[PDB]
Amino acid sequence: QVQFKLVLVGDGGTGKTTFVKRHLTGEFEKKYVATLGVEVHPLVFHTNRGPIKFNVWDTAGLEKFGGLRDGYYIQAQCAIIMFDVTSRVTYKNVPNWHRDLVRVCENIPIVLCGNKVDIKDRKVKAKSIVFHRKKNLQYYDISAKSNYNFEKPFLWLARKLIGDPNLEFVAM
Amino acid sequence: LKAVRLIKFLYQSNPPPNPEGTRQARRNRRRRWRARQRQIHSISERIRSTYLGRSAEPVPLQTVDEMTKKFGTLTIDCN
Amino acid sequence: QEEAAAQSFYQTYFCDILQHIFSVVTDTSHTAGLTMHASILAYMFNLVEEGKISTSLNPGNPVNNQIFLQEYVANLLKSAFPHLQDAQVKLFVTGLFSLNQDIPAFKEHLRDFLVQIKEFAGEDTSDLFLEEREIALRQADEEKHKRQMSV
RNA sequence: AUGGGCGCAGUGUCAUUGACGCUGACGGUACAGGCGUAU
Known about the structure:
The structure is cut from a larger assembly and holds chains A, B and C.
Chain A: E1 3-9, H1 16-24, E2 38-47, E3 50-59, E4 78-84, H2 88-92, H3 94-104, E5 110-115, H4 131-135, E6 138-141, H5 152-162, E7 169-170
Parallel strand pairs in A: 1-3, 1-4, 4-5, 5-6
Antiparallel strand pairs in A: 2-3, 2-7
Chain B: H1 3-13, H2 23-49, H3 58-73
Helix pairs in contact in B: 1-2
Chain C: H1 3-26, H2 34-49, H3 65-80, H4 86-98, H5 103-117, H6 130-150
Helix pairs in contact in C: 2-5, 3-4, 4-5, 4-6
The structure holds one RNA strand.
PDB class: rna binding protein/rna
Keywords: HIV Karyopherin Rev Crm1, RNA BINDING PROTEIN-RNA complex
Entry title: Cryo-EM structure of the HIV-1 nuclear export complex
């Protein structure tokens, strides 16, 4: 009920799997088991306006494990692009993911998330993170470890979907 | 207010260069102190001259006439 | 920096190191590290080019290590990549030696090779511009030799 | 009027927590003072 199809794009288990697990259990995974293809997880929030369900498709970010690849995006209702601020390469790969997503999903909200900002060694400075600007993506610095801005992307997506700009998540 | 008091207060507030230390240290302090003493002397002589010292005509020499000539230069040229 | 053990270490580990480096590079999963790859390969090849490695790496053939290295790399890649055209490997190795002093061009060359290995290319080399890429490699090697001589 | 190389305070460039300065509301509350000198 009141569920949306969400597609998560980025390097496999480079934060997408960790992010999904952290929102699921609350634990912060340490191991890096690169995601295989995609895993679909229910993920429920409670807003001032009732329950909300995300059908998060944590997709694999490694080509060898891409599997169906863009086929996962079919019928997607929202998209979360990810990248690790500690590695510029995963940032330069961002435009490719955006291209593929828009190509499959022409008009969908997009959140550009910089994962694991908590790790002190930040390579992709906040100054250079600009692709969202021209593409009109909603940006967030996040970190699944310390939960910095841990909820901002999901809250923004829920607001953009339901249409309530002032909608707020609730504990229960 | 009187010139003697102002000059004495000026000369009192500047400590003489410390004779202690090396020759070169004392001499560099002496040079800086003498430059600042020349500055102080210039200021004191300016005070000694008078309490206004300057006319305001420099302003029209810079802005009032540089505004009035172009005020005359104003041209409708329509619109 | 340690000359005495340098030759022994080279003879012991050079081919193994190149094997593993190439197995990594051809792997797309490690693409982000290519700069370091480019950083080290260009170094080692330069060492090979200047002959600072003195001993022949083939006990059965005391020839200059450069040509032996070329045959060994070609054989290794061809065995690992049977579907590739031999001329492609020849061009790629030639560039490796020619580009060992241009890290950006070297990295783009490695990326070009990685693009190629992804493709089962038939005898049709028309799309490959092998002559144009060979001319570019000749120009790059000419600049490299000019730089070396200018020293 | 002059600014040296480092005391490190913000950092721009690249191979970007490494290197050159600029720059930092800095390590500096420091240091340099013509080549006898009365400019």
